[PDB]
Design a protein around this ligand. Structure first.
Ligand SMILES: Nc1nc(N)c(N=O)c(=O)[nH]1
Ligand SMILES: Nc1nc(N)c(N=O)c(=O)[nH]1
Lengths: 261, 261
C-alpha cells in the first residue's frame, strides 16, 4: 500500500506493518526554559512512553520564549530516548530551531497557512511535515468537501515550497474549527482523506467532543478515545496521536491483527 | 433499519437506537445450588452491571444439577434487577426451566444442533433465541462461506420448530471451532452475516485469540476486547456480550455517536 518508508534522519518508519503511535509529551513548564525539573520530567515521561509502545514523541511549544522552552527538551530527549521527535509548532522560526536541536518531523496545526515559510523550513531540512486541517472560522458549505479542499490548499503551499510528496502527512484536525457534531461527521467520513494519496495522522485524544457524547471529564476519556482510535484505524489512518500510550498501543495492535495490517 | 423491536415479555429492546450490552453474569458456585453466598454474589453483580450500563444479564449453567444451580439465580435476579435475562444453555430441559423461572432469552452455543428440541422450547414460550456458530470439528473449505452455511442450518431447525424470524438473533461464535487465525478472519468479515437478515450478537470478551495477538493474560485483555467491540459495532452488530460492562458501554456509546446509530 505505501511503496516507500517515512524517512526520519536516523530512524525510518515503515507505514505498512503497523499503526504508528505518536506519544504526546507532557510539557508542564517551570515558573522560572532549560531548568532541571521540567527537562527531567519531560525525559522521564518520554521514556515511559517509549517503554509502553510509542513510535514518535510529540513535543509542544511569544516566539523567542517558545524556543527557550522547547529547544532544551528536544536536546535532552533526542539524546536520552531513541525515537523520532515531532515538533508541534506553526511558527517557521520555532520549527527551524527544533530540527537544529534534534527534532525529526514538523507537526503544523495550521497546515502551512499560519506561516507559509514553515514549509520552506521543511523543504530545506527535508523533514516530514504534518499538515492539519484548521481554519479561522466555521462556515462550512460542505464539511468534508471543504475539509479536503482546505487540506489541498495546504499541499499546494507545501509543494510550491519544495516539499516532496513523500514528506507529506495529512491530519483531519478533529477538534479544530468544527462543532461537536462536525467532529463526529469527520470521524464517520475519515476514509475520504485517502483519495488525496497521503498518509493520515488522527489526533482525537481526550478532546471535548468525546465528553460531549459521553458526558465525562477529561480524565474519564480513555474508552471514548479508544473508540475514535479504532474507527480511525479501520478507516485507514497510518498514525494516531495519543496521551495514553499503553492502552492505545494495545488497541492499535488488536485492530491491526483484525483489519489485516 | 430494524422495522420491529426485540420483544421480551415485560421489557422491549429497540434495535436501532444503540448497541445493546449483554453483561456476563459471574457464577462462582458453592461447594455445597440455592445457597446464600452464591445467589447473593450473583445478585450484587447483576446489580453492578445494571448500574454500569448493561441491557441484558447473561446467566450461564449434569442436567438436573445445572437446573438446581441456575434456577435460583434467575429467580433472585429477575426479582431484584429489572433487566431481561438470557439463559446460556444448549439443553432443552434446562432452557424450559429457566424461562419458567423468569428468563427472557435463550442463548444457545450449539445453535439448536446440540438438542433440536430447544427450538421447540423457544417456539412455545415465544422467546428470542441466540443461535451461535459452532461445530464439532475444524475442517473449513471456506471459513465464512461455511460459517454462513452452518448458521443457516440453525435457522432452518429454529423455523421448522415454530420460531418466528423476529425471535432469531445470530452470533458468529468467535472462539468456537476456529483457530486463532480463523477468529481474526471472522472479525475481518463480520459484515457478511448481515446478508442473512437477522440481528447479530458478538461475544469476544477476554478470549484467547486476543491473548494470541497481544500476548497478554486474561486479566490483561480490556483494550483488546475494546478493539473487537468497536470493529464489531462498525461492522453492524446489534448486541455485544462482555464481562467489562462499564468500559464497553462507554466504547459502544462513542462508536454509536460516530457511526450515526
Ligand atoms: N497533528 C496534530 N497536532 C496537534 N497539536 C493536535 N492537537 O490535538 C492534533 O489533533 N493533531
Ligand atoms: N452467544 C454467546 N454465548 C456464549 N456463551 C459465548 N461464549 O463466549 C459467546 O461468544 N456467544
Amino acid at each position: 500500500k505505501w511503496d516507500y518508508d517515512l524517512r526520519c534522519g536516523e530512524y525510518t518508519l515503515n507505514l505498512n506493518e503497523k499503526t504508528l503511535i505518536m506519544g504526546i509529551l507532557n510539557v508542564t513548564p517551570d515558573s522560572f526554559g532549560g531548568s532541571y525539573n521540567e527537562v527531567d520530567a519531560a525525559v522521564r515521561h518520554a521514556k515511559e512512553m517509549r517503554d509502553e509502545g510509542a513510535h514518535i514523541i510529540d513535543i509542544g511549544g511569544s516566539v523567542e520564549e517558545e524556543i527557550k522552552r522547547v529547544v532544551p527538551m528536544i536536546q535532552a530527549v533526542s539524546k536520552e530516548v531513541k525515537l523520532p521527535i515531532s515538533i508541534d509548532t506553526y511558527k517557521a522560526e520555532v520549527a527551524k530551531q527544533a530540527i537544529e536541536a534534534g527534532a525529526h518531523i514538523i507537526n503544523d496545526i495550521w497546515g502551512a497557512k499560519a506561516e507559509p515559510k514553515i514549509a520552506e523550513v521543511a523543504a530545506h531540512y527535508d523533514v516530514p511535515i504534518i499538515l492539519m486541517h484548521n481554519r479561522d472560522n466555521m462556515n462550512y458549505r460542505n464539511l468534508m468537501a471543504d475539509m479536503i479542499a482546505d487540506l489541498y490548499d495546504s499541499i499546494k503551499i507545501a509543494k510550491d515550497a519544495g516539499v516532496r510528496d513523500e514528506n507529506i502527512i495529512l491530519d483531519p484536525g478533529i477538534g479544530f474549527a468544527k462543532t461537536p457534531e462536525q467532529n463526529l461527521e469527520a470521524m464517520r467520513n475519515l476514509e475520504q482523506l485517502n483519495v488525496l494519496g497521503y498518509p493520515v495522522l488522527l489526533g482525537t485524544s481526550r478532546k471535548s467532543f468525546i465528553g460531549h457524547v459521553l458526558d465525562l471529564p477529561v480524565e474519564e476519556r480513555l474508552e471514548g478515545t479508544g473508540a475514535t482510535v479504532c474507527l480511525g484505524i479501520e478507516k485507514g489512518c497510518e498514525f494516531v496521536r495519543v496521551h495514553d500510550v499503553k492502552e492505545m498501543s494495545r488497541m492499535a495492535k488488536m485492530m491491526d491483527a483484525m483489519i489485516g495490517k
